[PDB]
Amino acid sequence: ELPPRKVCIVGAGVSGLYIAMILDDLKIPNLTYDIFESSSRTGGRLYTHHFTDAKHDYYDIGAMRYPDIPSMKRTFNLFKRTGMPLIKYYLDGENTPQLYNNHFFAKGVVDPYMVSVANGGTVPDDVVDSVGEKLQQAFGYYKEKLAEDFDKGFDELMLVDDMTTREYLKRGGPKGEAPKYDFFAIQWMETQNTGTNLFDQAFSESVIDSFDFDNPTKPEWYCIEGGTSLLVDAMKETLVHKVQNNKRVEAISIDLDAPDDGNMSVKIGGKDYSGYSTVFNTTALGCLDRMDLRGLNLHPTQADAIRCLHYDNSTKVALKFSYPWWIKDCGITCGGAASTDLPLRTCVYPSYNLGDTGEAVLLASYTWSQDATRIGSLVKDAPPEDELVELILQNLARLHAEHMTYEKIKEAYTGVYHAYCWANDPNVGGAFALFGPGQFSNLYPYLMRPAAGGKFHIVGEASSVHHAWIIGSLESAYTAVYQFLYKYKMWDYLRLLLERWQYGL
Amino acid sequence: ELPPRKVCIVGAGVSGLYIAMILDDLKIPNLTYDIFESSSRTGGRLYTHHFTDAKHDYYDIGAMRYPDIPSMKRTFNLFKRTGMPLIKYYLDGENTPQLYNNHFFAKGVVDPYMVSVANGGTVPDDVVDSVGEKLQQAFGYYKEKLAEDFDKGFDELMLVDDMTTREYLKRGGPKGEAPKYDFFAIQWMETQNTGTNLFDQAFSESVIDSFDFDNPTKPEWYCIEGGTSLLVDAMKETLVHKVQNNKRVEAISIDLDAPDDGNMSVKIGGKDYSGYSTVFNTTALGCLDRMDLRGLNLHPTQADAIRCLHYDNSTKVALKFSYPWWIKDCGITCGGAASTDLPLRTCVYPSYNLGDTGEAVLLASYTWSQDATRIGSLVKDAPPEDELVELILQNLARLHAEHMTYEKIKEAYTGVYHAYCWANDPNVGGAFALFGPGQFSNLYPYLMRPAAGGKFHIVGEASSVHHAWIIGSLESAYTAVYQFLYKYKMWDYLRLLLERWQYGL
């Protein structure tokens, strides 16, 4: 029979819970695991906030929406396996306002926002109304290759990964044969495509974001009615060994002088937990970098990747109202989102409360990058005149000025809100990977390099080509389990892993 | 006589206090001002934390060190006018450890950190030991022009401002005739020169940083004995009209249909404060963006600058010890700083407690960029074992392992520490401007564009070519006062401004 072995799973977000789900399904004789989670809470960046127990009285602080595209089949298979109650998510809705330079969008108007050179701004006239077309020309070849086969498309995209999005647009691609855009044209494309400054990160991440948000297959989107944390609950209930919360790992080691399979250990609260045949670290990389990893003798460039791979920021702000005034008064009847240059940047109309006529949640601000740092500076652990509330109410009034007043929005506000800035969470230290130029092609391979003689895995969304999505976490977890089984030559169970899990079970 | 006129100064950091100091010195008949400061505290990013009232029992949260170089003469003139007790600041000390890849630096040894290709890393052998020389080749031409004349040097530097530092190093400068560096070379230069990821910001900001930290004149450095806040105290005491604290401006307007000079107003807590002939906004740009500025009819690219000009983050962590073990046990007897790839990144040994043998403060961690975001995720408004303290003690022990143990450092630690992450300060929302590629040459001119018919000024360190130093704030405040006097044709007082203030008083 197989000898007794135990493995350590650091972190109980979705990738750690997925590792355990796979091990529980394979039922390998005499194999066990410990899962140590630093937080009192399990689920990580799957985190629904419930204002009350009322059915729809929540918002998702982390993951909230899922496009049904082939490259995310593993995510949807996880949803099926756990019985998630999926409902439609409306990425684009009806009647959602867009507000830039204090003007509302209107279709078939030239330069509705009055930012073109012709109207006294600095955006070139040939770009102001054609951002979508110009970015589809910049990204579209790669998007089509990614749709044919994500991993082959990605490898081809890596041949231009040295460039930022701005660099690609400025120089006309890698040999100057694509259109060349001036600073203000690029600035307007960024303003109309993503968060402030993100075109100074990798071109490849801008391509992949466009692939996921504007996929050639024109996919249906889904959300989990009741919040994404229903998935955490479901994954927890099947665990053979339950999560050990309030266990923050501070060091990971291997004793290369010991002949045993179980020669790895972790330190928690100054105490050694030993006897592990493999350690799967699933934390964000900032949390990993803080650990003492000398005991693992990591390649220096792998250590560089842990420190240096770039993370984006993100902040959410959700308010409760006494009735869904955006539905009733503004005609915003089926979700979507309102985009603006105002501080709140993006106001997301929930897809899960469309038929409610009483209290309703609005995801009034969802921001990335410097926009998220700025809103996040107003988000306090012990919330307080609350400057953030007043900013959001004032921005909401300006964004919905076609139908509402500040006074009526403020009156409808119940005084209950919640906000969260992920860069201020000590258990993540960022929202999610969003790599800088050259990082995917140069640092990422070293992040993914075998370590501790094939017994240590750096797992999670950053350790994948699908940053900022559940699919990246699940892929990364699947691959690590493959490597573990291969390392110990558990061929029956590796064949079973492929049979049952190569697309998600 | 001059007619009665009133101006409004938004913010009482050093910019706003300097505007007031200049007006108080000119004594313009019938001219008054109001200063409104959002915080209960005056001084902004000049902010000394006193642990107790004992003479050296402090650290500076914001500004702390000043190089005596010609372009900063206005700063030193302010120090002189206010009677600041300057003492030497040791940028480089004696016996300060440098720790990378778990190895200490050694002089005259090839690749002491063992990160080069020859030793199993990926840093090119010809770069690993010559970062200083290769960055002096990249920056030095411009550094020398800046030393001749800062404004002419800056205008010449703007002809390559489209590039990031990484882009300049990768492509060999603007026409490919400088040396071209691979990703890992550039990565090591960044690791050995600045904070994580900052080579992906403007080349011009890396040049100016190098100009300030490694100036060709090889300057003396100074600090203010007793803390930089002594300067704020001195500036406050001369004010003819004192700061009005807890007054956060939320809107600024001009009534163009009113003939009066005094046709500007600001809104504070829903109430209008009217009758201003000019408004000087001195806040960080994130705070300005949150205001309702519709009443000023700003050029859209000027509005873009306010939203988009990039800010760096910065975090500081200072610990008290029962004796200065770094002096007594480690021989670190005259200041300087220890750099490392460990999370704390830079440990700054104070220059103001060198003779002390009792309790002493250590600035154990000073970080920028993503390093600051990561440390800042552990900094809590109401502090808590404390993960940040334990991290700092552990990193300090590793950095000082040539002489100290973790146990002795922990035993010397008194249990009193303080930390601060500037991006989490609602009154700033970042540490300081650190522009992205193209921003100085494209967005900054619009930030500085006349507005409200020449009656509105966006003032402060970001509104200058000297980001992240007091000198930028003072130059920006001087320029705005020049523009105010010119706009109202106060030719006697404009001539007096030049006579008395063109180098600082």
Ligand SMILES: Cc1cc2nc3c(=O)[nH]c(=O)nc-3n(C[C@H](O)[C@H](O)[C@H](O)COP(=O)(O)OP(=O)(O)OC[C@H]3O[C@@H](n4cnc5c(N)ncnc54)[C@H](O)[C@@H]3O)c2cc1C
């Ligand atoms: C704002 C936001 C919006 C998102 N939107 C979506 C979306 O709509 N759809 C989608 O598919 N995905 C979305 N995602 C992405 C998705 O939430 C993540 O990719 C995924 O949840 C990450 O899971 P993980 O297991 O890789 O990491 P994590 O969830 O970070 O889990 C790691 C775990 O490790 C723990 N930990 C940290 N340090 C230690 C330590 N020292 N010891 C022990 N445990 C430790 C953490 O507390 C955490 O529980 C979003 C993410 C964010 C931030």
Ligand SMILES: Cc1cc2nc3c(=O)[nH]c(=O)nc-3n(C[C@H](O)[C@H](O)[C@H](O)COP(=O)(O)OP(=O)(O)OC[C@H]3O[C@@H](n4cnc5c(N)ncnc54)[C@H](O)[C@@H]3O)c2cc1C
């Ligand atoms: C970590 C750090 C280290 C530094 N190190 C040095 C150094 O060693 N040497 C050096 O020369 N410089 C240094 N600097 C830079 C220097 O501290 C700053 O450039 C300078 O203090 C900024 O002054 P300011 O008046 O431009 O802005 P601020 O200091 O930000 O002042 C603006 C004021 O406006 C207030 N305000 C904000 N919003 C509103 C509102 N809505 N209504 C009213 N008031 C409002 C703010 O509270 C603040 O008091 C450092 C800065 C940082 C962050």
Ligand SMILES: N[C@@H](CCCC[NH3+])C(=O)O
């Ligand atoms: N999955 C997240 C982030 C996508 C953008 C990642 N750069 C969302 O749906 O908002």
Ligand SMILES: N[C@@H](CCCC[NH3+])C(=O)O
């Ligand atoms: N003046 C600050 C910041 C300098 C670097 C700005 N990018 C210091 O001395 O640390």
